[PDB]
Design an enzyme around this catalytic site. Structure first.
Site, PDB file in Angstrom:
ATOM      1  N   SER A  61     -51.946   8.089 -10.617  1.00 23.38           N
ATOM      2  CA  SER A  61     -52.630   6.974  -9.942  1.00 23.38           C
ATOM      3  C   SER A  61     -52.826   7.117  -8.429  1.00 23.38           C
ATOM      4  O   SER A  61     -53.572   6.325  -7.832  1.00 23.38           O
ATOM      5  CB  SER A  61     -51.942   5.651 -10.268  1.00 23.38           C
ATOM      6  OG  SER A  61     -52.140   5.445 -11.690  1.00 23.38           O
ATOM      7  N   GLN A 117     -54.317  -0.315 -19.857  1.00 25.15           N
ATOM      8  CA  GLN A 117     -54.898   0.899 -20.421  1.00 25.15           C
ATOM      9  C   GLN A 117     -56.234   0.636 -21.109  1.00 25.15           C
ATOM     10  O   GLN A 117     -56.413  -0.389 -21.794  1.00 25.15           O
ATOM     11  CB  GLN A 117     -53.939   1.482 -21.478  1.00 25.15           C
ATOM     12  CG  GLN A 117     -52.599   1.938 -20.911  1.00 25.15           C
ATOM     13  CD  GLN A 117     -51.398   1.288 -21.633  1.00 25.15           C
ATOM     14  OE1 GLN A 117     -51.382   0.082 -21.901  1.00 25.15           O
ATOM     15  NE2 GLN A 117     -50.389   2.095 -21.929  1.00 25.15           N
ATOM     16  N   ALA A 313     -48.226   8.538 -11.420  1.00 28.16           N
ATOM     17  CA  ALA A 313     -47.511   9.191 -12.526  1.00 28.16           C
ATOM     18  C   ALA A 313     -48.434   9.580 -13.640  1.00 28.16           C
ATOM     19  O   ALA A 313     -49.380   8.864 -13.948  1.00 28.16           O
ATOM     20  CB  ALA A 313     -46.400   8.283 -13.072  1.00 28.16           C
TER      21      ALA A 313
HETATM   22  B1  BZB Z   1     -50.840   5.521 -12.439  1.00 26.70           B
HETATM   23  O1  BZB Z   1     -50.144   6.838 -12.259  1.00 26.70           O
HETATM   24  O2  BZB Z   1     -50.009   4.393 -11.961  1.00 26.70           O
HETATM   25  C1  BZB Z   1     -51.038   5.363 -13.965  1.00 26.70           C
HETATM   26  C2  BZB Z   1     -50.372   4.376 -14.713  1.00 26.70           C
HETATM   27  C3  BZB Z   1     -50.775   4.541 -16.103  1.00 26.70           C
HETATM   28  C4  BZB Z   1     -51.729   5.659 -16.321  1.00 26.70           C
HETATM   29  C5  BZB Z   1     -52.217   5.958 -17.591  1.00 26.70           C
HETATM   30  C6  BZB Z   1     -51.780   5.164 -18.664  1.00 26.70           C
HETATM   31  C7  BZB Z   1     -50.886   4.094 -18.477  1.00 26.70           C
HETATM   32  C8  BZB Z   1     -50.380   3.777 -17.206  1.00 26.70           C
HETATM   33  S1  BZB Z   1     -52.081   6.438 -14.857  1.00 26.70           S
END
Ligand code: BZB
Length: 356
Positions: A61, A117, A313
């Site tokens: 993210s 999602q 993440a």
């Molecule tokens: B980001 O790294 O905060 C993300 C959080 C999610 C992603 C894909 C699927 C679910 C949560 S990318």
């Protein structure tokens, strides 16, 4: 590096790696403008490949900071406005719940509870339209924040529509290229695969799977060098030559909404500096956290006295970026394990606090 930088970094990161059992890590500290790099461990455990300054990590993210800036650049070009309805750029979104939902709401997670999602069942583009048409908001727009890939992802996809460019082509041309981020990719080219670290989840090597709106929400891979250059660009936007890109950076660090001590930008999230890490952690283990927001009317332009940050993440990776414009100070930590956010923030705070 100055021994002082060396010592704070090594004393903080060494125990982090040991405690979290991180296979490989890269860190950059930006200090009075200049970057200092540190690497540990393995990009690929089985093939015994070390992490180097050229290793690619999945940003997860943290990719949204790029999406935010590219959106801001489109605003500055006059291609889009944040005050515009979503339906202006997606006329096929005729369902009535979309009335009053603006591109600002999408960019800042405030559309009324778009889901975290996009479902895996959403393969094709008509599946995607169907998903947004059938979505039932729990709240009125501009009342609560719910962190959501489906919200920022849609903002990214729509922001580039007037340009006629694919999201990837717009990102390459308007952001990566002007900033000399020449080892930053939405899709890793075969030439660069040698440098693509594996992620590790429950001991298994993994890469992020394809998904709808992946590029816009969590799809960027980068090196510690390019990420340091990214932080420099965000620390000193007014030194960037491309006028709309300069504006786009400043727009992404503007404060649109406040929840607690935290302010939402486009991709970036901000707190007033100075701030205690207890506040940073808490204002950033929870699958869904719905929080009422107060509108900042009108948005505060980028405040130099801010802790500006984003965690990231994927299944196999954990990233963090934080910087303080007033102190010309920043840090990037990229790891090929997804380890708890509080540990990332604690380590970053320990380092930056020591250097300011
Ligand atoms: B980001 O790294 O905060 C993300 C959080 C999610 C992603 C894909 C699927 C679910 C949560 S990318």
């Amino acid at each position: 590096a100055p021994q002082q930088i060396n010592d704070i970094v090594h004393r903080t990161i060494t125990p982090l790696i040991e405690q979290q059992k991180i296979p490989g890590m890269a860190v950059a500290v930006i200090y009075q403008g200049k970057p200092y790099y540190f690497t540990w461990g393995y990009a690929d455990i089985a093939k015994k490949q070390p992490v180097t300054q050229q290793t690619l990590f999945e940003l997860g993210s943290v990719s949204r900071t790029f999406t935010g800036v590219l959106g801001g650049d489109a605003i500055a070009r006059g291609e889009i406005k944040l005050s515009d309805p979503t339906t202006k750029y997606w006329p096929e979104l005729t369902a009535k719940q979309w009335n009053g939902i603006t591109l600002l709401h999408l960019a800042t997670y405030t559309a009324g509870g778009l889901p975290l999602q996009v479902p895996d069942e959403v393969k094709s583009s008509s599946d995607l339209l169907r998903f947004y048409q059938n979505w039932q908001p729990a709240w009125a727009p501009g009342t609560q924040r719910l962190y959501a890939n489906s919200s920022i992802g849609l903002f990214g996809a729509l922001a580039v529509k007037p340009s006629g460019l694919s999201f990837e082509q717009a990102m390459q041309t308007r952001v990566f290229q002007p900033l000399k981020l020449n080892h930053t990719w939405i899709n890793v080219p075969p030439a660069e695969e040698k440098n693509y670290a594996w992620g590790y989840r429950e001991g298994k090597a993994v890469h992020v799977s394809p998904g709808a709106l992946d590029a816009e929400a969590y799809g960027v891979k980068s090196t510690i060098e390019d990420m340091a250059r990214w932080v420099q660009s965000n620390l000193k936007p007014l030194d960037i030559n491309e006028k709309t890109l300069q504006q786009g950076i400043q727009l992404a660090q503007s404060r649109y909404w406040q929840t607690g001590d935290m302010y939402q930008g486009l991709g970036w999230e901000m707190l007033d500096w100075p701030v205690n890490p207890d506040s940073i952690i808490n204002g950033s283990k929870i699958a869904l956290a719905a929080r009422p927001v107060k509108a900042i009317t009108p948005p505060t332009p980028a405040v130099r006295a801010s802790w500006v940050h984003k965690t990231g993440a994927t299944g196999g990776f954990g990233s963090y970026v934080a910087f303080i414009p007033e102190k010309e100070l920043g840090i990037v930590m990229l790891a090929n394990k997804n380890y708890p956010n509080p540990a990332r923030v604690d380590a970053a705070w320990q380092i930056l606090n020591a250097l300011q």
